[PDB]
Amino acid sequence: NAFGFLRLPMNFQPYDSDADWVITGVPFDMAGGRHGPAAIRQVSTNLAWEHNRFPWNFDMRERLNVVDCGDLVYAFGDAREMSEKLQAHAEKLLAAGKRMLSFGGDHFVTLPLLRAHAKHFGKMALVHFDAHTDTYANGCEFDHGTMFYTAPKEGLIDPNHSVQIGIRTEFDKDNGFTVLDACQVNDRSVDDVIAQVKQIVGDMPVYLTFDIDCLDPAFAPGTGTPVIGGLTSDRAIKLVRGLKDLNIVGMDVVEVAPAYDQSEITALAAATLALEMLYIQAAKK
Amino acid sequence: NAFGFLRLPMNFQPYDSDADWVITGVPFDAGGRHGPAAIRQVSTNLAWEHNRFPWNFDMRERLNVVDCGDLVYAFGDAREMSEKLQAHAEKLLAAGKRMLSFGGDHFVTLPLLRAHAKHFGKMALVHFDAHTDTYANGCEFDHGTMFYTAPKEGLIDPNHSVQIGIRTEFDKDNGFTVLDACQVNDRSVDDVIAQVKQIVGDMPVYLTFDIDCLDPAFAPGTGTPVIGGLTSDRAIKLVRGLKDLNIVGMDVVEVAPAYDQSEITALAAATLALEMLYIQAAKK
Amino acid sequence: AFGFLRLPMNFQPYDSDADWVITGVPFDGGRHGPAAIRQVSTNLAWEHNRFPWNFDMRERLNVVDCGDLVYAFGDAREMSEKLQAHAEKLLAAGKRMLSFGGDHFVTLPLLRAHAKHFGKMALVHFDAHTDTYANGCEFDHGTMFYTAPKEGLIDPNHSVQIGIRTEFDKDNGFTVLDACQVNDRSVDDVIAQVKQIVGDMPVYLTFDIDCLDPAFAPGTGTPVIGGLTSDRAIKLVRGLKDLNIVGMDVVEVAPAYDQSEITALAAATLALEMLYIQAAKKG
Amino acid sequence: NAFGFLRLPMNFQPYDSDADWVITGVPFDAGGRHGPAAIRQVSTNLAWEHNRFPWNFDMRERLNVVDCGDLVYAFGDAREMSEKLQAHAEKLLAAGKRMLSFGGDHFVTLPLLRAHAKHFGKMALVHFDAHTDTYANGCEFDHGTMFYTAPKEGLIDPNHSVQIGIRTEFDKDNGFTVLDACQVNDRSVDDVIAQVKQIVGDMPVYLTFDIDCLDPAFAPGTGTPVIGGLTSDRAIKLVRGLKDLNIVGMDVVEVAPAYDQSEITALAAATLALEMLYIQAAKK
Amino acid sequence: AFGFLRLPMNFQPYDSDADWVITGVPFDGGRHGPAAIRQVSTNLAWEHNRFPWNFDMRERLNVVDCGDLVYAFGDAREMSEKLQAHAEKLLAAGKRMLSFGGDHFVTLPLLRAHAKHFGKMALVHFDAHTDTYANGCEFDHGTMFYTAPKEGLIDPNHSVQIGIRTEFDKDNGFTVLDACQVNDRSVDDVIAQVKQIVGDMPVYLTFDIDCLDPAFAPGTGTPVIGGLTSDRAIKLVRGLKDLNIVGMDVVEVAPAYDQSEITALAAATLALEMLYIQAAKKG
Amino acid sequence: NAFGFLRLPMNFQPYDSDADWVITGVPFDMAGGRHGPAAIRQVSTNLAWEHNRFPWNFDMRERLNVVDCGDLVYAFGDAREMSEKLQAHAEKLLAAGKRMLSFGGDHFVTLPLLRAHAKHFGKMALVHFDAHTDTYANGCEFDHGTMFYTAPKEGLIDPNHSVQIGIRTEFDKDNGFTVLDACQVNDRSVDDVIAQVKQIVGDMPVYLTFDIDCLDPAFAPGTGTPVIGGLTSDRAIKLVRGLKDLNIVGMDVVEVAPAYDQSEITALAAATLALEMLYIQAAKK
Ligand SMILES: [Mn+2]
Ligand SMILES: [Mn+2]
Ligand SMILES: [Mn+2]
Ligand SMILES: [Mn+2]
Ligand SMILES: [Mn+2]
Ligand SMILES: [Mn+2]
Ligand SMILES: [Mn+2]
Ligand SMILES: [Mn+2]
Ligand SMILES: [Mn+2]
Ligand SMILES: [Mn+2]
Ligand SMILES: [Mn+2]
Ligand SMILES: [Mn+2]
């Protein structure tokens, strides 16, 4: 109570709660993204004092019952156990009617989530903010750059209605994934880019995943794999806000590595983005 | 002598000096006390330029600026800081001097507004910040309440005031014109300045600049950060675009050196401060 | 596997199958610039094709890193002389130079060696400063582009200075594209004007990292607010492909003032782009 | 559940729990608010040890410890923090629980002393700090005045109290025995502990630990640092040497994470905290 | 001039006039340990005779640095196998090893190679942890000195563990000199007991940097308060001269958590002492 | 006024003031010791609130008129001008009857000071706290490791009554300088070491110079040339305090490089040592 993200209530038995949205922390890397959820929670008090978060004219916590269920408990080193307890957690939540905002953690945390969400929402469109496309063909079982190769192959997402925003590194130009790379995103208007995004997604249900490395290192230095020429936090937030009218079933923010943060501005970016992900959900009501 | 901000002369008895502009540091409340120190130390970066770019003249040739050090007051006592600070300002103003002031908590502006209102009348406030600082029901010494109190005491006129760079909850119905960061970041400097001049009119202006207006990327060293702010480039051009307004006093506040990174925030504040001085000099 | 971008170290590069040689020049807190740049560059090494390129620079050029220049602990005079000798023998053997600072001063020896082998050059200069101070000490950064034209090394009248944010001289023949306008103009616009100024002349490309705004390059000794973004820096560099760049360096990185290695990463990324735009013209 | 300090259970309704010891965080005033957060985050470093060295048993097997989170109070209001904090403590104490408390400003101890005095009588204070915190003429909410006020309100008896690690000006004439850092650093642990036991007697003890007691080399993360302090090794052995005293409550305060370096200070505090728990457990 | 302590790099060290070879083993935030250690070591290089010694180690041993071990980005199994192969071929050619971590796990391959060439060894272990966990993952730091005795690589009964500050097993044959007593006893006292435990057996010297108190070595991934000072660490290492040390490593340095480079400097200084005490016995 | 070190009065015209002791800052390196005096001043407020600085039972500022004259103004790059304006400054102060506590800055700052002091006090005994002996035979004209070679050769100090405390690096064992190296200093009692110091110095006038690198890097990380195995701040302060009965004519603290400081603990060590240097002067009265 008054102890989680944004001073929301902790509830460690959330499956039968009245919550609409459950926040879950997943401290996991396989560096230093393990403390991402702690850092995000700790800095979110910056945001909590606004009754109506700018620029909105209503309070999210009045339109949505959001609870923080803490962090996922699993064997210290084991990633298989992480992955299985994460998908299990996610399935039990979805079956109870709840929706998920999730804090990472390694981006790999997303595969368990997509798997669980796919069972309840069908094949999904992926809106992916990152500097990496994370479609690596031959990597380790738990590599965090291989999950959006594995997800289409397991029929979890449809590349042909997915969009990858802020890319700045080598990628495969023929996946059916539409790559809106940081170069053009930075040189195009937010409206322009949202228009193109909406055209691709359709009315398909969306999973929204945001690796913080998508922001330029100056705006978000606290990440393990930085790439220069990224987005501003102002552009990120405007883009996220522009996704209001999509059918976003679930969402997560990942790769925040507090050990490389500077005066918390990377955790602040994640907490503000996570809150915007909530407000756009509340604004559809 | 050669020891204060920008290697300007220290003068701890400025009231009868032949200085036009007096720099005053006010170390007051986290940890924005070293704001003035940080600003002065980093300012030597700028001092070597004879004509600070992009100006084609030397501010120091057109204006006598002296740095009078920091305001002495009972260490924790805030009611002393205010009375000592207003008195300082009143005596400087009566002697014909003008003030560039370094914070320090943003609250320090309210004493300076009281002092300035007695000498210049009701003012227009040009307010760069991420917060509107109009909180109605707060502690008498809360930093985010100065622009609720000031209109109520008749110091400033909301209806010619403007609040630039806002990124947090505010009050749309109170007379202040709020140019939010979302907007300012998407609009040209000329567009915004035009609008600023429209609202302000011919009226006299007190310019207050809370560094949290700048995005934490450029001003990480602040106590209450908000993402999606202004760049240093935009902040400096906007400030430079107020040349033609009647700016009677000015301050830069909320630099918390504990959270600064490679002295970036203090550099921005000192640069902005210097630009505030050139605006004055380019009219003389 | 051990030098910049996991390239081969070759401490005997004068006779070698390499077409380009990377040389660290630790010199003054920019001693450690070259180390910082190498260490962070592994972030880029894993990309077969460095985005947004369509091929691997490593398959179009043999590039080797011969380490750092050895000179007397404090003697800058030996530093200069051993630096210019180093280049003269590299440039002599039909090998090019990407060099890492280090003090910006390091460019002046390199310009002396380059002028003997390519003639008077156009200077493409990324910096917040113009570095043209006449009445300055013998070994001093800032003064090089007063000395270099008087020694007939570069032609101011085809030289361009990009990102300037500080006091400078308007009447000396250098074209200054200050950070105020560079940030308000399109890259294409600026590149067009660069190409117009330089013409067909061989260019030396020098990049003082303070050109970037301190938010992006905090790790610098002489920082100035209101500079360029890394995005704009990289697009401008990339836009110089069609010019004839004979030599290039990246200087002023100071790790003691770096934050989460972002200055070093910006310099390593720019340096890699300087290599790609070379590889772009040979293939 | 598995979420609080040392991965212990959270329980936000601890008053009727079957817990022996309750951990409470009090975020209050620079920037010692994140003291509790910092302590909890770093504490996982210790949690993996089943028998925390050098003990030959597991504290968690002998004691039910729960973490009840942080004290909620009106954000800036300090008079609320005190009344809410004393009430919290009184209700826990009446229910038979004992308190390990994380600061937070050192001032938080005075409410906890009021609560404890009602349940345990007048106490002996064992006080590790670089400051004596006995300032007579201060603000009602000044951190360095709690051990002037507490004797005057009859909460503690100076004549069985001891102040360990002092490195700054103090008052020799007020009943407290002051073991200065110069002395403690030159004397064996057994020597000092002998003396501590002599002074304290059989009387009940409240153990308060301000982290600035540790030399800034080991606890850089503090707001008022003083050189020539204690090592973490000496601090932990001294604390461990109080096993036989009747310690009724305990706290660790003044961890300012903004000034911490690689989480060293928070680690020391959490380790010391855990040792405070083992002292209790080794008597049960 | 480019490796540790400005020693020569030699990427082909198997046939070389060197008697000792320095090898970085970047492995997991200890990837960057070896770099950090090399970069800071120049602080020591300028001393002809490293204090308090009466001669130059560099004039009694040929020491070279062959860089870092090349292995698959994430495959630790290849890391181990290429590491043990590396050592087996070095130890085979009559060359010794000072190695830099890197994860402490790196020692286990090195112990496998060393045991084949020197037999079962006494372990002199500086760490806050005993690293004897039985029921742990295949590749995991902490478990090595459970695996190493079961594989007959070391003899617990002549092995000593110095600086322990955490849970451990009292009954397994290892002699634990915990940081509580080590800090309360004289170096001579402790060295005497070390010499008594080890006897005439060949020793492998492994130094996990968390042994030092976090105040002295902040840059570590698993820190524990109440550890050793660098002064005491260096005096203890120095006191092992008369023992027969066949191989040595320094591990767990994590720069992401270092403060003003003091952890790296402590490790580079210890490593240099490990070299002097070798040079002490040959001259 | 109330603006210098320890909130003491600034006085930029100190030669004819009533001060006994003048504090002078010398921002100079030839890295990053230039801001040493600023850092020292800024952190000294930590100390200023104690009326009687522990462990003393009197107030220094009651027994001594101490003023801070600011920093020495000279040509930005030129060290010759630094050196000459520094010695000139020092001579004018000494001739006026004033005594000097000086903040560095590069250790080289000491040569101008010794030169000026020698003219007024004669040949001096040097009490030197540092990890380096600074007796380098062949270095640059302004090398900061060569000044205590140059000073005996110019007849400024007598090595045979000088003592070098906390040494941890290669030095020349036959200078007549008595080296009390950190190894033994750390293993010997403070009384023991002071006794030996007093025996060597005699009643000769002492210049006390303290390079902060003498402290172990953990206690004082903010220096350019660190060496491990140094002294604690507690031992440094006790030793300095033990020099009360020597005839210390002048004093300085040098090499504080704020760019490598951690939470100001290096500047705090210098400011506390500098204050102790003042209290021992006041305690003889
Ligand atoms: Mn990414
Ligand atoms: Mn990703
Ligand atoms: Mn604000
Ligand atoms: Mn404000
Ligand atoms: Mn520059
Ligand atoms: Mn330059
Ligand atoms: Mn205290
Ligand atoms: Mn206290
Ligand atoms: Mn360990
Ligand atoms: Mn270990
Ligand atoms: Mn030294
Ligand atoms: Mn020295």
Written as one string, the DSSP assignment of chain A is ---SGGGPPB-S--TTSS-SEEEEEE-------TTHHHHHHHHTHHHHT-SS-TT-SS-HHHHS-EEEEEE----SS-HHHHHHHHHHHHHHHHHTT-EEEEEES-GGGHHHHHHHHHHHH-SBEEEEE-SS----SS--TT-TTSHHHHHHHTTSB-GGG-EEEEE-S---TTSS-EEEEHHHHHHS-HHHHHHHHHHHHTTSEEEEEEEGGGB-TTT----SS--SS-B-HHHHHHHHHHTTTSEEEEEEEE---GGG-STTHHHHHHHHHHHHHHHHHHHT-
**E-assigned strands of C116-275?**
122-126, 160-162, 175-177, 203-208, 245-251
F95 to chain D, minimum CA–CA distance in Å? 36
> Which is nearest to E132 in space by CA: E91, E96, E176?
E176
Judged by 3 or more CB pairs under 8 A, whether E touches C is yes
A partners (3+ CB pairs within 8 A) are: B, C, D, E
Method: X-ray
Residue E128 Cα to ligand 10 midpoint, Å, equals 7
Which residues surround the ion ligand 5 when the cut-off is CB under 5 Å?
C 127-129, 208, 210
Instruction: Provide the residue count of chain B.
Output: 284
Q: List CB contacts of E84: < 8 A, sequence separation 6 or more.
A: E109, E110, E112, E113
Q: Rounded distance, CA C222 to CA C128, Å?
A: 9
B82 to chain D, minimum CA–CA distance in Å? 17
Angle at A219 (CA atoms; ends A215, A224), nearest 5 degrees: 65
> Starting at the edge strand that comes first in sequence, how are the strands of the sheet with D65-70 ordered?
D65-70, D21-26, D98-103, D247-253, D205-210, D124-128, D162-166, D177-180
Contact B184, B192 (CB under 8 A): yes
Contact E174, E161 (CB under 8 A): yes
> Starting at the edge strand that comes first in sequence, how are the strands of the sheet with B205-210 ordered?
B65-70, B21-26, B98-103, B247-253, B205-210, B124-128, B162-166, B177-180
Q: Rounded distance, CA D85 to CA D71, Å?
A: 7
CA dist list (Å): A80 to A74, A75, A91, B3, E9: 10, 9, 17, 63, 42
> Which is nearest to A261 in space by CA: B47, C147, F192, B225?
B225
Residue of B nearest to D223 (CA): B31
Kindly compute the dihedral angle of the four CA atoms of residues F92, F95, F100, F105, in this order, to the nearest 10 degrees: 30
Judged by 3 or more CB pairs under 8 A, whether D touches C is no
Q: Fill in the amino acid letter for F50.
A: E
Q: Which ligand is nearest to the CA of E144?
A: 10
Q: Rounded distance, CA F107 to CA F256, Å?
A: 10
DSSP state of D10: B
Q: Is F184 exposed, middle or buried (0-12, 13-18, 19+ CB in 10 A)?
A: middle
CA dist list (Å): C87 to C27, C90, C98, C117, C278: 16, 5, 11, 10, 18
Kindly list the residues from chain F whose CB atom is less than 8 angstroms away from the CB atom of residue D261: 262-263
**E-assigned strands of C19-130?**
20-25, 63-68, 96-101, 122-126
> How many of the other CB atoms lie within 10 Å of CB of D139?
13
Contact D165, D131 (CB under 8 A): no
Residue E247 Cα to ligand 6 midpoint, Å, equals 48
User: Which SS3 state, helix, strand or coil, does residue F276 take?
Assistant: helix
Q: List CB contacts of C107: < 8 A, sequence separation 6 or more.
A: C101, C144, C204, C206, C249, C251
Q: Tokens at residue B120, please?
A: 């210049």
- A170–C contact, CB cutoff 8 A: yes
Helix (H) or strand (E) holding E80: helix E76-92
* Dihedral sign (CA A245, A246, A252, A258): negative
Q: Rounded distance, CA D270 to CA A166, Å?
A: 41
**Between B and F, how many CB-CB pairs are < 8 A?**
29
Instruction: Spell F223-241 as b/e; 16+ CB within 10 A means b.
Output: bbbbbbbbbbbbbbbbbbb
Task: Give me the number of domains chain C comprises.
Answer: 1
Q: Which ligand is nearest to the CA of A107?
A: 2
Kindly list the residues from chain B whose CB atom is less than 8 angstroms away from the CB atom of residue A55: 180, 182
Residue C102: is the preceding peptide bond cis (ω within 30°)? yes
How many distinct helices (H) and strands (E) make up chain D?
10, 8
Instruction: Spell F47-79 as b/e; 16+ CB within 10 A means b.
Output: bbeeeebbbbeeebbebbbbbbbbbbebeeeeb
**What phi, psi does B265 have (nearest 5°)?**
-65, -45
Contact E56, E49 (CB under 8 A): yes
Kindly list the residues from chain E whose CB atom is less than 8 angstroms away from the CB atom of residue D264: 214-215, 218, 223, 225
Q: Smallest Cβ distance to D1: which of A2, A12, A49?
A: A12
> Gap positions in chain D, given as the residue before each gap (C–N > 2.5 A)?
29
CA dist list (Å): A65 to A16, A68, A243, D1: 13, 10, 21, 21
Beta strands F247-254 and F163-167, pairing class = unpaired
Q: Rounded distance, CA D11 to CA D14, Å?
A: 6
Judged by 3 or more CB pairs under 8 A, whether C touches A is yes
Angle at B264 (CA atoms; ends B262, B265), nearest 5 degrees: 125
Kindly list the residues from chain A whose CB atom is less than 8 angstroms away from the CB atom of residue C215: 218
- According to DSSP, the residues that pair with C65 across neighbouring strands are C9, C22
Answer whether B226 sits within 8 Å of A46, measured CB to CB: yes
C43 to chain E, minimum CA–CA distance in Å? 12
- E158–C contact, CB cutoff 8 A: no
Q: Rounded distance, CA A78 to CA F196, Å?
A: 61
Q: Rounded distance, CA E186 to CA F187, Å?
A: 10
C260 to chain B, minimum CA–CA distance in Å? 11
Q: Tokens at residue E114, please?
A: 């060393």
Q: Tokens at residue E265, please?
A: 């400097």
Q: Smallest Cβ distance to B41: which of F2, F38, F76?
A: F38
E partners (3+ CB pairs within 8 A) are: A, C, D, F
Contact D272, D102 (CB under 8 A): no
- According to DSSP, the residues that pair with E124 across neighbouring strands are E160, E205
Distance of CA C249 to the CA centre of its chain: 2
| Radius of gyration of chain B from its Cα atoms, rounded to whole angstroms | 17
Q: Rounded distance, CA D109 to CA D129, Å?
A: 13
Angle at F246 (CA atoms; ends F245, F251), nearest 5 degrees: 120
Q: Rounded distance, CA A111 to CA A79, Å?
A: 12
- A261–C contact, CB cutoff 8 A: yes
> Starting at the edge strand that comes first in sequence, how are the strands of the sheet with A247-254 ordered?
A66-71, A21-26, A99-104, A247-254, A205-211, A125-129, A163-167, A178-181
- E215–F contact, CB cutoff 8 A: yes
3-state secondary structure C217-236: CCCCCCCCCCCECHHHHHHH
Q: Which ligand is nearest to the CA of D225?
A: 7
Contact F248, F201 (CB under 8 A): no
CA dist list (Å): D159 to C253, D165, D197, D210, D244: 60, 18, 13, 21, 19
Q: Rounded distance, CA E51 to CA F55, Å?
A: 35
Q: Which ligand is nearest to the CA of D109?
A: 8
Give the residue ranges of DSSP H helices in chain F. 36-43, 45-48, 60-63, 79-95, 110-121, 147-153, 182-187, 190-201, 233-242, 265-283
Kindly compute the dihedral angle of the four CA atoms of residues D71, D74, D75, D80, in this order, to the nearest 10 degrees: -70
Answer whether C51 sits within 8 Å of A181, measured CB to CB: yes
Question: Domain range spanning residue D9?
Answer: 1-284
| Radius of gyration of chain A from its Cα atoms, rounded to whole angstroms | 17
**Between E and F, how many CB-CB pairs are < 8 A?**
61
C76 to chain F, minimum CA–CA distance in Å? 12
Q: Rounded distance, CA A62 to CA A64, Å?
A: 6
Answer whether C213 sits within 8 Å of B236, measured CB to CB: no
Instruction: Provide the residue count of chain A.
Output: 285
Kindly list the residues from chain B whose CB atom is less than 8 angstroms away from the CB atom of residue C215: 217-218, 231-232, 264
Residue for token pair 């985005």:
C51
Q: Rounded distance, CA A272 to CA A5, Å?
A: 11
Q: Tokens at residue C263, please?
A: 């200055």
> How many of the other CB atoms lie within 10 Å of CB of D54?
17
- According to DSSP, the residues that pair with F167 across neighbouring strands are F181
Instruction: Spell C183-205 as b/e; 16+ CB within 10 A means b.
Output: beeebeebbeebeebbeebbbbb
- D141–F contact, CB cutoff 8 A: no
Kindly list the residues from chain A whose CB atom is less than 8 angstroms away from the CB atom of residue B166: 54
What DSSP string runs through D199-228? HHTTS-EEEEEEGGGB-TTT----SS--SS
Instruction: Tell me the helix, strand and coil percentages in chain E, rounded to 5.
Output: 40, 15, 45
Contact B242, B193 (CB under 8 A): yes
> Which is nearest to D248 in space by CA: D271, D279, D272?
D279
3-state secondary structure chain B: CCCCHHHCCECCCHHHCCCCEEEEEECCCCCHHHHHHHHHHHCHHHHCCCCCCCCCCCHHHHCCEEEEEECCCCCCCHHHHHHHHHHHHHHHHHCCCEEEEEECCHHHHHHHHHHHHHHHCCEEEEEECCCCCCCCCCCCCCHHHHHHHHHHCCCECHHHCEEEEECCCCCCCCCCEEEEHHHHCCCCHHHHHHHHHHHHCCCCEEEEEEHHHECCCCCCCCCCCCCCCECHHHHHHHHHCCCCCCEEEEEEECCCHHHCCCCHHHHHHHHHHHHHHHHHHCCC
Residue of E nearest to C67 (CA): E2
Contact E124, E240 (CB under 8 A): yes
Instruction: Tell me the helix, strand and coil percentages in chain D, rounded to 5.
Output: 40, 20, 40
- F34–E contact, CB cutoff 8 A: no
Angle at D43 (CA atoms; ends D40, D45), nearest 5 degrees: 150
- D52–E contact, CB cutoff 8 A: yes
N-terminal to C-terminal alpha carbon distance within chain F? 25
CA dist list (Å): B201 to A179, B113, B205: 48, 19, 10
- F217–E contact, CB cutoff 8 A: yes
User: Which SS3 state, helix, strand or coil, does residue E124 take?
Assistant: strand
> How many of the other CB atoms lie within 10 Å of CB of F2?
13
Contact D211, D269 (CB under 8 A): yes
Residue for token pair 């522990």:
F54
Contact F223, F256 (CB under 8 A): yes
Answer whether B53 sits within 8 Å of C259, measured CB to CB: no
Residue for token pair 């698993």:
E222
B partners (3+ CB pairs within 8 A) are: A, C, D, F
Angle subtended by helix axes C33-40 and E33-40, to nearest 10: 170
> Which is nearest to D251 in space by CA: D18, D71, D94?
D71
* Dihedral sign (CA C100, C106, C108, C109): negative
Q: Smallest Cβ distance to E260: which of F170, F227, F262?
A: F262
Q: Which ligand is nearest to the CA of C251?
A: 6
Interface test with C, best of A133, A172, A225, A228 (most C CBs within 10 A): A228
Q: Rounded distance, CA B228 to CA B222, Å?
A: 14
Contact C145, C136 (CB under 8 A): no
Q: Is A73 exposed, middle or buried (0-12, 13-18, 19+ CB in 10 A)?
A: middle
Residue B54: is the preceding peptide bond cis (ω within 30°)? yes
Answer whether A73 sits within 8 Å of D48, measured CB to CB: no
Q: List CB contacts of B84: < 8 A, sequence separation 6 or more.
A: B71, B72, B73
Kindly list the residues from chain E whose CB atom is less than 8 angstroms away from the CB atom of residue F182: 231
Kindly list the residues from chain A whose CB atom is less than 8 angstroms away from the CB atom of residue B260: 263
* Dihedral sign (CA E253, E258, E261, E266): negative
C233 to chain B, minimum CA–CA distance in Å? 15
Residue B208 Cα to ligand 3 midpoint, Å, equals 11
